[PDB]
Amino acid sequence: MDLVEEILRLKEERNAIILAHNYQLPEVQDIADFIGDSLELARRATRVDADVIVFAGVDFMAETAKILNPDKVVLIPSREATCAMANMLKVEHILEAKRKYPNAPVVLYVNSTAEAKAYADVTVTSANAVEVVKKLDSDVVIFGPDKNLAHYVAKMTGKKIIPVPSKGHCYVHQKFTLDDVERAKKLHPNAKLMIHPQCIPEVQEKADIIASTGGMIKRACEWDEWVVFTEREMVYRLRKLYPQKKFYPAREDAFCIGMKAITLKNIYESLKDMKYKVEVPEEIARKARKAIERMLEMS
Numbered sequence: 001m002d003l004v005e006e007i008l009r010l011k012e013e014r015n016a017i018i019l020a021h022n023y024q025l026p027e028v029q030d031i032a033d034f035i036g037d038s039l040e041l042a043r044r045a046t047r048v049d050a051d052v053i054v055f056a057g058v059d060f061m062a063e064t065a066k067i068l069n070p071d072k073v074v075l076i077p078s079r080e081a082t083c084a085m086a087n088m089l090k091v092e093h094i095l096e097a098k099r100k101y102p103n104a105p106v107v108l109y110v111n112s113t114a115e116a117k118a119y120a121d122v123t124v125t126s127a128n129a130v131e132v133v134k135k136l137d138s139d140v141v142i143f144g145p146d147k148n149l150a151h152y153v154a155k156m157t158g159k160k161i162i163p164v165p166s167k168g169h170c171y172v173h174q175k176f177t178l179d180d181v182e183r184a185k186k187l188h189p190n191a192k193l194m195i196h197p198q199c200i201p202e203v204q205e206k207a208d209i210i211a212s213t214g215g216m217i218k219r220a221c222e223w224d225e226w227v228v229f230t231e232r233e234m235v236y237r238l239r240k241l242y243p244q245k246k247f248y249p250a251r252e253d254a255f256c257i258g259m260k261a262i263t264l265k266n267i268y269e270s271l272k273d274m275k276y277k278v279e280v281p282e283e284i285a286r287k288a289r290k291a292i293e294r295m296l297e298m299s
């Protein structure tokens with residue numbers, strides 16, 4: 001079967017757009033209308049003229065698109081496409097930190113449930129986390145859920161960061177160790193290292209550039225040979241964007257299972273049956289909308 005043909009005709013007949021993340025399968029990225037990191041996906045979700053949004057990504061990404069487009073239909077092709085790090089942060093975690101630090105603003109990674117965003121003062125992505133926290137008036141900030149990004153933000157802003165929870169992390173990026181850095185410099189001595197801020201601090205210290213996947217794309221021009229310390233599919237995105245550069249994955253087992261829950265087949269089935277509809281309750285969506293919008297205007 002030619003899934004590509006059927007997906008494109010059905011998408012066009014339903015006035016739908018496909019938004020994919022850089023971690024999506026190569027066959028998914030090839031049919032996507034727009035590809036970017038979480039921040040670029042959020043800003044693209046504010047200029048959607050289509051009636052239907054098919055989100056080739058994880059659940060928190062689709063919910064963010066739904067919060068920014070309550071009048072539109074937002075479809076996620078599989079409800080198992082979830083983010084392990086996002087689900088580590090609970091509402092009770094935030095309430096506990098707000099009781100312990102009443103005058104500290106709550107700054108949440110976009111990788112978070114919609115219910116968690118309802119208690120956040122402003123959201124952040126990997127590309128704008130430092131800029132937003134630096135622009136906050138308070139010197140003590142409640143931050144979550146990713147502990148490794150919190151370390152990078154504390155280093156780059158000089159703020160006192162209260163991490164919530166204590167062990168919040170992404171298992172995909174925590175696979176990278178110092179041994180991978182030493183191996184990369186040995187097998188590619190002329191390459192430079194682009195490392196995601198969700199990696200452990202000791203790995204971040206060895207990086208040439210620390211950035212989100214969007215920041216990796218904007219700064220890939222500074223060199224011609226890169227070892228990429230992030231999810232595996234990002235290397236495909238970089239290789240196709242820059243056919244005359246060299247990119248190597250730091251680990252071939254650094255793949256996100258939740259991201260690969262999206263396939264070409266369930267995208268077709270998503271457009272065929274208008275499923276699965278992403279819904280956010282009004283009270284939760286309204287409070288989260290203010291934090292997401294504040295992020296958009298602060299970055």
Ligand SMILES: O=CC[C@H](O)/N=C(/CC(=O)O)C(=O)O
Binds near residue numbers: 037039211
């Ligand atoms: O700026 C948006 C990036 C976003 O905050 N997150 C990520 C990594 C992720 O949490 O999947 C990326 O680099 O794409």
Ligand code: SF4
Binds near residue numbers: 259
């Ligand atoms: S990669 Fe880590 S953070 Fe990005 S989605 Fe998969 S689990 Fe959540």
Ligand SMILES: [Cl-]
Binds near residue numbers: 017047048050
């Ligand atoms: Cl559009």
